[PDB]
Structure 1
């Protein structure tokens, strides 16, 4: 999800964009600014929430030894979903 600054310069996923009066925009004249179009925050928000009937779940990121260190998430808070913070993956207990 790329966004355009008021000076016509693309804004990166870190919010970086030179100011209007910043002289450092001269480096992009007759050239281009390297911006990655895919936003990890947007993609992980697009990812859904997995419902599992357990108080504690485990996430290793998928792939086993090719993922991240296996961690355990406690799904007791019913006001929010438990997020594995290695891969930003949300898990939840079945309500209703």
Structure 2
């Protein structure tokens, strides 16, 4: 029903997708207890937030940042 509006109009949609583009990252490690996640360069990026990785194997990438992060 709705679908007759973009007929012949070629329907802009997003070639890439970030739905998961994340998992290709070389998930880092440190060798320590808690870390500083300020991302993308100093003072451009998420506010500094410290996360604890002590589980066994996991990490936690703060959720602003997304970038897979662990020890």
TM-score, normalised to structure 2, is: 0.84
Q: Indicate whether 1:45 and 2:34 are aligned.
A: no
Where relative contact order (Cα < 8 A, 6+ residues apart) is larger, the structure is 2
Structure showing the higher helix proportion among its residues? 1
Partner secondary structure for residue 22 of structure 2: helix
The 4+ residue runs of structure 1 with deviation greater than 2 A are none
Structure whose alpha-carbon radius of gyration is higher: 1
Instruction: Please provide the CA RMSD for this pair.
Output: 1.4
How many residues in Structure 1 have an aligned counterpart in Structure 2?
Answer: 71
Gaps of 5+ in 2: none
Gaps of 5+ in 1: 1-22
Partner secondary structure for residue 25 of structure 1: helix
